[PDB]
Structures are given as structure tokens and as C-alpha cells.
Amino acid sequence: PSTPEEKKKVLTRVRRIRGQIDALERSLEGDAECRAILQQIAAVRGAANGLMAEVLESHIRETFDRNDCYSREVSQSVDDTIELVRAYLK
Amino acid sequence: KKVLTRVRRIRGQIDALERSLEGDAECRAILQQIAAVRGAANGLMAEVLESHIRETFDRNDCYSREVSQSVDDTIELVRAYLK
Amino acid sequence: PSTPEEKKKVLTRVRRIRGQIDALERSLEGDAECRAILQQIAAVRGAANGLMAEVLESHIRETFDRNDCYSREVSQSVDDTIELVRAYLK
Amino acid sequence: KKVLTRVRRIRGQIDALERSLEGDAECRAILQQIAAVRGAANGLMAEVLESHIRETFDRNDCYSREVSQSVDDTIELVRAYLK
């Protein structure tokens, strides 16, 4: 993030991830079944990966823009690149 | 246990990332740290799995040098895949 | 596998994986799109994982049996364990 | 184009696995080798993505040291996640 607007959304998501980690401690200290925990942990990893893709997409786009290089073909390269990352970096 | 040890390290990573963001760090650094959170979610999953597996086979009243390896190799395999 | 029957099923699956690696090789010899290649590689990995579970499950089962220790609860534990491995080792 | 480099070495692992089985190796050893097949496929994926990412951002006629690093950093993540 470079824009203060991007700073805000990421902080939101990051906080929401601390929100998911709270419920995991809450569940760990309590009466949780390993299958419910593993699921909570998996959703943490899902959330991180979600955000990683959103930061990456945003970073790549800003790089091309500072370089006066943003066009529709560049923009779609990024679309293509992020679909792959979303699908294969887990 | 060794599990909460890891839940804190995760919380540790998220608060630093929350602060990286507050302290306006460079984008490479934000990505570096989100990837590291994911890596620790995998490491934590490798503990909780290791717990449930260790615990499920002591529970079955089958002790043996041979059964212990079988359970070490299962754990070694989990560790390879999740690190 | 210790059993001469289980050696055969596994050896099929391994060959079926060679068959997938040859199709992948065809697709790099000739030219298919870069997303169809990724999909092929993921399918190889899905096949390896798939077999890693089948072998793991059989190995654990044999260990309890060989120790005169096989019951239904031991059997369902292995069911519970493999379902997790299938779901979380990728 | 060092994709064949790896597709070969992966075929190398499958045949050794086929030998292990024909040659009555330990059940522990089969699992070790199947995990390494999976590990190789991930490495293969980390090359094929690297090919595509590089190829896709040179094709945009946008050169600059700052753009090169953004692409290095992308490729670093790809490597971190897959090995």
C-alpha cells in the first residue's frame, strides 16, 4: 500500500485476521475438537492468502502507474497474473 | 502447550504487520510479512495435526517400537508437507 | 505395501502418473496454453497426494494388524486420521 | 527454458519409485519418495509460473529497474510459497 485508502483496507483485513486468531485462542483454551480448530487455522491461512493477493495486485499496478506505463493490456496482464497466484499460491 | 506458543508467534507477526502498516513501511515488506503469516499458519497446523495423531494412537492401547515408528513416519510426513 | 496385491495397485497408480507426465511432456513438446500446463502439473500433484494417502493408510493399517492390535476403534481412528491428511497435506 | 530440466528429473523420481516397488523396498521409503514427487511438482509449478510472469511483463514494453524489482519480488513470493 502507498495510497492512504489502501493502508486503511489492509489494516481492516489484518485486524479481521487478528479477529480470527482471537477465536482460535478462545476455541483452544475451551472445548474445541481438533477438526474445528484445523478449520479455524485453515481459514486464517485462507485470509492471509487472500490479503497477500490483494497487496500483490495493488503493488504491481502501482509500479506500472509510477512508470507512466498503465494501459488496458498491462491491466489485463495483472488480471491474468493474479488469477494464477490466487489459484496456485496456497 | 507447544500450540499456544505458536498462536502467540502468529499474533506477534500480525501486530508487527499492523505496525508496519501504521509506520508506513515499503510494500515489499508488507508482502514479506503476509507470506510469513501463511507460513506460520502451516507450522501451527503441523502441530495441531501432530497432537491429534499422537493422541489418537496412544488412546488405542497399542504400544510397540514398531507402532511408534509408524507414528513417527506419519509425523515426519506431515512435517515435510507443512514445514 | 508389504502385501503382493497392494504392490500391484500402487504400481498402476505410479504408471498412471507417468502417463500424466508424458501428456505434460507432449504439451511442452508441442504448444498448449500456459494455464493448461499449470492445470496438468496440479493434477500430477493431486495424483501424488492421492497415492501418498492410499499408501499411508495401508501402511498404518498393516502396522496395527502385524501387532495383533486391529479392532474397529483402531480402524475408525485411521479413518479419522486419513480424512485429515487428505484434507490438509497438499 | 529450464522446464524440461525439471520434467525429466520428475520422470526420474517416478521410475525410481517404480524400481523401489518392483524391488520390494520398505513401505517407509515409498512414502518418502511419493512426498518428493509432490515436492517436485511444486518446484515445476514454481518454474512454469516464473516463465509466464516474466514473459507477460516483458511483453508489455515497460522496462525500468523499479519494474524489474516488482517482478523479482513477485517471483520471490512464488518461490516462498512453492519452493
Short mmCIF file of C-alpha atoms in Angstrom, two decimals, chain B:
data_model
loop_
_atom_site.label_atom_id
_atom_site.label_comp_id
_atom_site.label_asym_id
_atom_site.label_seq_id
_atom_site.Cartn_x
_atom_site.Cartn_y
_atom_site.Cartn_z
CA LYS B 1 1.05 -26.16 25.05
CA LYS B 2 3.59 -26.02 22.14
CA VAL B 3 0.41 -24.89 20.32
CA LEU B 4 -0.24 -21.64 22.22
CA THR B 5 3.50 -20.91 21.84
CA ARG B 6 2.79 -20.80 18.14
CA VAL B 7 -0.56 -18.96 18.42
CA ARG B 8 1.36 -16.08 20.13
CA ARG B 9 4.12 -16.03 17.46
CA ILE B 10 1.25 -15.68 14.91
CA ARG B 11 -0.26 -12.83 16.98
CA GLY B 12 3.27 -11.38 17.20
CA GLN B 13 3.52 -11.38 13.38
CA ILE B 14 0.08 -9.73 12.94
CA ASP B 15 0.76 -6.92 15.42
CA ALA B 16 4.09 -6.16 13.65
CA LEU B 17 2.31 -6.18 10.36
CA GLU B 18 -0.35 -3.95 11.87
CA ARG B 19 2.53 -1.66 12.99
CA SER B 20 4.47 -1.91 9.67
CA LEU B 21 1.26 -0.56 8.18
CA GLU B 22 0.83 2.15 10.83
CA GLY B 23 4.55 3.07 10.45
CA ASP B 24 4.22 3.29 6.64
CA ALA B 25 6.78 0.58 5.57
CA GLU B 26 7.50 -0.32 1.96
CA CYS B 27 5.20 -2.70 0.04
CA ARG B 28 7.90 -5.43 -0.31
CA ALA B 29 7.97 -5.60 3.47
CA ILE B 30 4.15 -5.95 3.82
CA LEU B 31 4.17 -8.86 1.35
CA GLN B 32 7.18 -10.39 3.06
CA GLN B 33 5.25 -10.46 6.31
CA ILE B 34 1.86 -11.67 4.94
CA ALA B 35 3.76 -14.65 3.39
CA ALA B 36 5.34 -15.26 6.78
CA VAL B 37 1.88 -15.35 8.48
CA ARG B 38 0.78 -18.03 5.98
CA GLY B 39 3.99 -19.97 6.70
CA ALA B 40 3.19 -19.91 10.41
CA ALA B 41 -0.47 -20.92 9.89
CA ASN B 42 1.05 -24.05 8.14
CA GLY B 43 3.51 -24.59 11.04
CA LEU B 44 0.70 -24.37 13.56
CA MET B 45 -1.39 -26.79 11.54
CA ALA B 46 1.56 -29.20 11.68
CA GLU B 47 1.48 -29.07 15.49
CA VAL B 48 -2.28 -29.48 15.94
CA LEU B 49 -2.19 -32.36 13.46
CA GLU B 50 0.78 -33.84 15.31
CA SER B 51 -1.22 -33.51 18.59
CA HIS B 52 -4.42 -35.20 17.29
CA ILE B 53 -2.38 -38.03 15.73
CA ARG B 54 -0.10 -38.66 18.70
CA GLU B 55 -3.18 -38.55 20.98
CA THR B 56 -5.41 -40.76 18.81
CA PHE B 57 -2.86 -43.66 18.78
CA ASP B 58 -1.90 -43.66 22.46
CA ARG B 59 -5.70 -43.78 23.03
CA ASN B 60 -5.79 -47.16 21.12
CA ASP B 61 -3.79 -49.13 23.67
CA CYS B 62 -1.18 -50.27 21.17
CA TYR B 63 2.36 -49.67 22.35
CA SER B 64 5.29 -51.05 20.46
CA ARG B 65 8.62 -49.95 18.95
CA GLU B 66 7.09 -50.73 15.51
CA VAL B 67 3.84 -48.74 16.11
CA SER B 68 5.94 -45.81 17.36
CA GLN B 69 7.90 -45.63 14.08
CA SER B 70 4.73 -45.87 12.03
CA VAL B 71 3.53 -42.85 14.06
CA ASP B 72 6.95 -41.05 13.68
CA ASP B 73 6.86 -41.54 9.92
CA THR B 74 3.32 -40.19 9.79
CA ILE B 75 4.51 -37.14 11.73
CA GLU B 76 7.66 -36.82 9.55
CA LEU B 77 5.34 -36.74 6.53
CA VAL B 78 3.08 -34.10 7.95
CA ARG B 79 6.23 -32.04 8.74
CA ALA B 80 7.58 -32.38 5.14
CA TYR B 81 4.27 -31.16 3.60
CA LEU B 82 3.56 -28.27 6.02
CA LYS B 83 7.07 -27.41 7.36
#
